[PDB]
Amino acid sequence: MTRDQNGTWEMESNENFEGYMKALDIDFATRKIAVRLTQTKVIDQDGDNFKTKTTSTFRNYDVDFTVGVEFDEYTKSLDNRHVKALVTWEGDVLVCVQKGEKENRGWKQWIEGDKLYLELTCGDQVCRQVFKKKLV
Ligand SMILES: CCCCC/C=C\C/C=C\C/C=C\C/C=C\CCCC(=O)NCCO
Helix, strand or coil, rough: CCCCCCEEEEEEEEEEEEHHHHHHHHHHHHHHHCCCCCCEEEEECCCCEEHHHEEHHHHHEEEEEECCCEEEEEHHHCCCCCCEEEEEEEEEEEEEEEEEECCCEEEEEEECCEEEEEEEECEEEEEEEEEEEEEC
């Protein structure tokens, strides 16, 4: 029973964020800033209801969803695309498919220990992020 992802999470690694961004057509100048940043993720979870905020000094991004309920996602200030997003549970892994103009776009997020893992995929590019839980 590791579906509880509540907390504030601080990035410790960000593998192939460059390639993921390039697959989303983010311009070089934006990538130059974005690749350098430590991100923080705040997850406020009540059962299958999630409110998430991802922050950095350069851009912030909020997305709220209920597991199992498809929603309209506009990736404002990121790549600024519209997708149909669906989050499901695969075991205790949170899986999101972002159906739209990019093939094989989605993410997967899960807990191990005091770490949160987030794998983001677009096309043939996978970005692997690891976050450590912040003490309250
Ligand atoms: C918000 C700080 C990062 C700002 C980056 C600025 C410009 C790069 C442009 C496009 C790259 C695309 C997504 C950023 C990666 C990760 C952001 C979170 C993606 C999510 O949906 N996670 C699941 C939340 O439940």
